Amino acid sequence: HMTADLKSLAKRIYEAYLKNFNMNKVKARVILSGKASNNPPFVIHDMETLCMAEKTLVAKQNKEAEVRIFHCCQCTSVETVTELTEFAKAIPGFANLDLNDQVTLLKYGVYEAIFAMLSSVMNKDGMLVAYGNGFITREFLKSLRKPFCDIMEPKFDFAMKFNALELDDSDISLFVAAIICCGDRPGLLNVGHIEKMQEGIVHVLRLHLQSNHPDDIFLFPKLLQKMADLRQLVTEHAQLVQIIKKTESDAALHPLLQEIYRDMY
């Protein structure tokens, strides 16, 4: 099937994934299904239930509801970028890179990786929030005003098709590593070497998908398509973030998030 140094590359990536993302698909699916517990997550389905939830998040304000949700999103984004950064540094070859190429890979990778992993925490009707303690409804997110209602629905559309692939966490960690180790991000210095590094990951991903989903024989090309869709998804999402920076005088981006969007698409 596949050799040792490829098997070693796979488990390094899976273990780094298990270590760096508190929420993962196995844990999310159990909450969502959901056996293992009869105490479901608090459901945030309208303005009133939202305020109930916020009465808990006291220390962590008087802004419009849309903007407060926009703030909860930023907090979740910041720490996922943070975890993603730890995860990247653990991919063999990544830390060896120019450091600059590392910033560039992360800059263009993180949001494709975020929306890939976000699927895990979404079903057709809503998504887990607050580390699995909440569940905010899709319809409620659509019910917000523009352009805030226009942020999640595309992510849901992607997630429903992506979740149809039935990936588990071992697939997803390889997929996320391939997203980040992407040889054609703009401004990369050592395109030749990064490309070598990604073809190793992509190779481990292909053989792993053969072994883990034998009947779904075009799963890998499907995943390749998903990577192109993620790029489009992120470009459009970047466009919406720009429209908000210069149209909503009350939704400042976290500094780290300004770093990533600055000079992107």
């Binding site: 950064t85 910033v103 992360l106 500094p255 780290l256 000079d263």
Partner: peptide, 11 residues
Amino acid sequence: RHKILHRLLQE
């Protein structure tokens, strides 16, 4: 230009 991201990659 990416000072926080640099920071994160060092620690």
